[PDB]
Amino acid sequence: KCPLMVKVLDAVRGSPAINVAVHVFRKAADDTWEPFASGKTSESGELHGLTTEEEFVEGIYKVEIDTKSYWKALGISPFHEHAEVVFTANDSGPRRYTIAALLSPYSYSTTAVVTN
Amino acid sequence: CPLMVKVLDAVRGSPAINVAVHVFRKAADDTWEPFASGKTSESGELHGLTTEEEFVEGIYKVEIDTKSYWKALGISPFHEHAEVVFTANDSRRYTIAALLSPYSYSTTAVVT
Amino acid sequence: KCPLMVKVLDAVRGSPAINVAVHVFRKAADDTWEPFASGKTSESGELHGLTTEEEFVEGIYKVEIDTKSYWKALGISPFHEHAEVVFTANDSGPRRYTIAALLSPYSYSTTAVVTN
Amino acid sequence: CPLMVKVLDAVRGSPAINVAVHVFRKAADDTWEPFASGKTSESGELHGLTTEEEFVEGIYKVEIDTKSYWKALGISPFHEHAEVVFTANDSRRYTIAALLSPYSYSTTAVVT
Ligand SMILES: C[C@@H](CON=C1c2ccccc2-c2ccccc21)C(=O)O
Numbered sequence: 001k002c003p004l005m006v007k008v009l010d011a012v013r014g015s016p017a018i019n020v021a022v023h024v025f026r027k028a029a030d031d032t033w034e035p036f037a038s039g040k041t042s043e044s045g046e047l048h049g050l051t052t053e054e055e056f057v058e059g060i061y062k063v064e065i066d067t068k069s070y071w072k073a074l075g076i077s078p079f080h081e082h083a084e085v086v087f088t089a090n091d092s093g094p095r096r097y098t099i100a101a102l103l104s105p106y107s108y109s110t111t112a113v114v115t116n
Numbered sequence: 117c118p119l120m121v122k123v124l125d126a127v128r129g130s131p132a133i134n135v136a137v138h139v140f141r142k143a144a145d146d147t148w149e150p151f152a153s154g155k156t157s158e159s160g161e162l163h164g165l166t167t168e169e170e171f172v173e174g175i176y177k178v179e180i181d182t183k184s185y186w187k188a189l190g191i192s193p194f195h196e197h198a199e200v201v202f203t204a205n206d207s208r209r210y211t212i213a214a215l216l217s218p219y220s221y222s223t224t225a226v227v228t
Numbered sequence: 229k230c231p232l233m234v235k236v237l238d239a240v241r242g243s244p245a246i247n248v249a250v251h252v253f254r255k256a257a258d259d260t261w262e263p264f265a266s267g268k269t270s271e272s273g274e275l276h277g278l279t280t281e282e283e284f285v286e287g288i289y290k291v292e293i294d295t296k297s298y299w300k301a302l303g304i305s306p307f308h309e310h311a312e313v314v315f316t317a318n319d320s321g322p323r324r325y326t327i328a329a330l331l332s333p334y335s336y337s338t339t340a341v342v343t344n
Numbered sequence: 345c346p347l348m349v350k351v352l353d354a355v356r357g358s359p360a361i362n363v364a365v366h367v368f369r370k371a372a373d374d375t376w377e378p379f380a381s382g383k384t385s386e387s388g389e390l391h392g393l394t395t396e397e398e399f400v401e402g403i404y405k406v407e408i409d410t411k412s413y414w415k416a417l418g419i420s421p422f423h424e425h426a427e428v429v430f431t432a433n434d435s436r437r438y439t440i441a442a443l444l445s446p447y448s449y450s451t452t453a454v455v456t
């Protein structure tokens with residue numbers, strides 16, 4: 001299985017958010033953010049294949065979603081620079097994580113679905 | 117003010133102004149009687165709907181006319197309206213807040 | 229394809245909302261709500277097979293999600309009686325509709341994803 | 345009050361009380377300088393963070409300590425915290441509102 005997936009929806013058009021840039025970081029032993037994985041959502045607004053179970057070890061992760069470039073190419077000037085989701089992962093063994101974000105120019109919501 | 121309504125616009129980051137709101141009480145025959153109504157003010161709020169005397173235990177529906185709000189802004193919406201249905205009992209002050217987007221809304225109750 | 233699907237998530241547990249009752253109605257020519265379809269979300273919190281393209285004609289629909297029974301069997305007394313989503317469908321030809329609801333005891337959110 | 349914070353609890357339908365909030369300004373070297381902080385009051389609100397003089401154009405991050413809030417209630421949360429990152433420019437009053445659930449939060453900006 002694929003342990004980390006990202007799903008993005010547009011709440012203005014009622015559609016997947018397509019071609020949204022995503023960057024994932026893991027908190028360093030030295031207290032800082034190391035690049036972990038990056039990608040772009042597809043035509044269904046999903047991003048698969050960021051990591052593997054082997055490489056996705058315990059840690060603190062930050063999933064940064066580049067909402068402002070997205071809204072920009074649609075002629076919108078949004079409030080947020082981006083949407084960042086920060087969470088501890090795999091601290092009681094391996095899990096599968098989907099991080100969904102719902103986007104509006106001045107609002108966004110994010111929910112995590114974690115299965116075992 | 118036992119019952120207040122607060123509407124926001126997630127496209128523009130602003131109160132949602134002049135939104136028609138209709139409130140209904142469920143009658144014993146299972147249908148909705150009009151109870152209160154109004155339009156949101158400049159701060160997206162609607163106060164003075166009921167009084168403590170009249171706001172007795174029961175099932176109330178609050179209906180927010182979101183489709184007109186979007187239509188007047190030139191934006192095409194998904195929902196006919198947004199409806200919030202709950203039971204008021206005595207075991208407070210109720211704020212019903214709604215956050216609007218054309219294809220998405222949320223609603224939260226703040227009970228204090 | 230399957231023209232109307234419902235997806236329900238629990239925002240307290242970060243999981244699909246399983247065994248959630250859903251009732252769909254269509255607005256009558258005589259101004260009232262006729263029963264159109266009903267079902268229960270599965271282990272992924274999805275409900276498929278409510279209708280067919282042939283039977284899913286233009287109209288106004290109401291998708292009622294029985295949030296209070298759900299929260300009740302988990303020992304929670306929620307605010308809402310249910311979550312109802314009301315929308316015009318297929319008014320410019322057939323579409324596919326997913327109605328997602330996100331649920332918390334005093335809050336819920338619903339978004340529609342409409343594709344063609 | 346150029347910048348205000350409003351936190352709500354979606355599990356209990358109540359303001360989120362005594363939530364630590366830290367605000368940062370981005371420094372020219374690309375790092376976050378502490379700027380303002382406080383705890384939400386009984387009505388889930390935090391006022392008096394800055395003044396108009398000090399709140400100049402720039403990128404600000406607001407960080408809401410949601411994990412402590414849930415931990416103190418005996419409920420296990422998903423996020424380390426909730427962060428809102430935006431640019432303040434002069435082309436207002438900013439309310440940053442956050443609606444919290446253990447595995448889900450939303451944030452909306454009301455700019456008037
Ligand atoms: C996304 C959530 C958040 O609600 N946002 C609120 C909100 C946003 C800006 C200013 C005041 C409020 C407020 C007051 C009482 C209850 C909720 C709010 C929703 O409206 O469902």
Ligand SMILES: C[C@@H](CON=C1c2ccccc2-c2ccccc21)C(=O)O
Nearest residue numbers: 100102109326328329330337338339341
């Ligand atoms: C906060 C928004 C977001 O919806 N979340 C979705 C969501 C979250 C996790 C996995 C799949 C989905 C999905 C698929 C189709 C449409 C919506 C979603 C809501 O559910 O109201």
